[model samples]
Target: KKSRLWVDRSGTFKVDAEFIGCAKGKIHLHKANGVKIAVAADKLSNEDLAYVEKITGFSLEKFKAN
Candidate 1:
């Protein structure tokens, strides 16, 4: 799992999550053990979004829901 960081839409919370993947306005993350999580794309700040792109080299905004 890739270690990455994220922020909520309100820009109020910061979390370091296992960067799994992203699609459909959602960011999919997980742990090697438990508690997988998904955060909405719009819920993150511009910097957070860019950071996601930096780590995964996959920007969530590049596609539409399929």
Candidate 2:
């Protein structure tokens, strides 16, 4: 699985993750100076999220997704 990220002028972030079997793959990470930060899905985990919050000094809301 791979993911792509995009940042908009409105400080909004977008992430897209895809699963391509088990061969070739692709991932994208993007960010803007004063905008939102984007990260790959495969590169994200619970621990990574915690580190991001700590390093970026931001509090992210938690929720459940089905």
Candidate 3:
């Protein structure tokens, strides 16, 4: 199955990960004040979800769909 990937850059913060098999996606980076953010999608990964979370301080809930 194909996966999705994205990036969130806000509040002077940056996250870099490896995303694989992702053909399409979007990134919504927000500040603590509900402001939008901009960042670069370094890459996507299927095996490094935990590593991504640890480095970015972001939860898997942010990446998964509703």
Candidate 4:
């Protein structure tokens, strides 16, 4: 489980979460407290989104939900 800090656009919100995967333009994560959250990639900070893209090997914004 690779854990990283997930930050939002405003940089005011941050969380320690394990990156699960990306699908349907959403980044799935599991929080330190065992909570699961799926956030839109566009909602995250640029750095965080880049991290997600690197992990998933795809652009989130262009991801088509199937």
The residue pairs in collision within model 2 are none
Tens-digit lDDT track for model 3 on 1-66?
Answer: 112233333324334323322222433344344445443333323233334455456554444333
- Return the lDDT, model 2, position 26: 18
* TM-score to native of every candidate shown: 0.62, 0.28, 0.25, 0.74
- Evaluate all candidate structures by whole-model CA lDDT and list the values in order: 0.67, 0.33, 0.37, 0.74
What is candidate 4's TM-score against the reference?
0.74
Clashing pairs in 1: 9-43
Report the C-alpha lDDT of model 1 over 1-66, residue by residue, as the tens digit. Answer: 455565676768777777677778787877444568887777677766777777677764543231
How many clashes (backbone atoms < 3 Å, residues ≥3 apart in a chain or on different chains) does model 2 have?
0
Poorest 10 consecutive residues by lDDT, candidate 2:
18-27
Q: Order of candidates by lDDT, top first?
A: 4, 1, 3, 2
Order by TM-score, highest first:
4, 1, 2, 3
**What is the TM-score of candidate 3?**
0.25
Question: Which ten residues in a row are the worst by lDDT in model 3?
Answer: 1-10
